């Protein structure tokens, strides 16, 4: 069995001055609401502030590529639609492998607006972060952006910019296997 996807959002990545491709996320709206809604609202920019022209600030090799802040790029910023932070909802899904998205928090019940795309099976993060998505396509784009050169602070020397971000509606919730990729 598996969870049912409900909506899809696409990201356009630009490493420096070149384009790489498209990433299509699948978000579980029936298992984890109030988080998919936040991600979709930020992606489609109903209230103005959003992921448009954002940046990736952690490109840690072999581990993940974390980004999502849009107020300040140093990693001490970012806000949601529910004020500033909202509590963790439920840890029903685990980090089953590469390409599973989650919500980066700075403690307990401190969810903000920063996600991270996992690249290896990180089972020691279970029970601490909430998982709400899966990278359906464009895994090679994630592989290409993961390998960029970085200094000692994990920041990429060449900027990675989310050029565009939209939302694709799904007419039928279909299940996806709880596996890698």
């Amino acid at each position: 069995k598996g969870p049912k996807v409900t909506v899809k959002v696409y990201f356009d990545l630009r490493i420096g001055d070149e384009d790489v491709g498209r990433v299509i996320f699948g978000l579980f709206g029936k298992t984890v609401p109030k988080t998919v809604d936040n991600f979709v609202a930020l992606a489609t920019g109903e209230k103005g502030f959003g992921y448009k022209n954002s940046k990736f600030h952690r490109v840690i090799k072999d581990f993940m590529i974390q980004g999502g802040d849009f107020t300040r790029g140093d990693g001490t910023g970012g806000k949601s639609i529910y004020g500033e932070r909202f509590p963790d909802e439920n840890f029903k899904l685990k980090h089953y492998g590469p390409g599973w998205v989650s919500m980066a928090n700075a403690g307990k019940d401190t969810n903000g607006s920063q996600f991270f795309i996992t690249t290896v099976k990180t089972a020691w993060l279970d029970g601490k972060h909430v998982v709400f998505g899966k990278v359906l396509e464009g895994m090679e784009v994630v592989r290409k952006v993961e390998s960029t050169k970085t200094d000692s602070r994990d920041k990429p020397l060449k900027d990675v910019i989310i050029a565009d971000c939209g939302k694709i509606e799904v007419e039928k919730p279909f299940a996806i296997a709880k596996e890698a990729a």
Binding site: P33, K34, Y82, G83, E84, R85, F86, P87, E89, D109
Partner: peptide, 12 residues
């Protein structure tokens, strides 16, 4: 019905 509408943070 929806159980997620009844819960909100401590600051709120």
């Amino acid at each position: 019905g929806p159980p997620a509408a009844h819960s909100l943070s401590e600051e709120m």
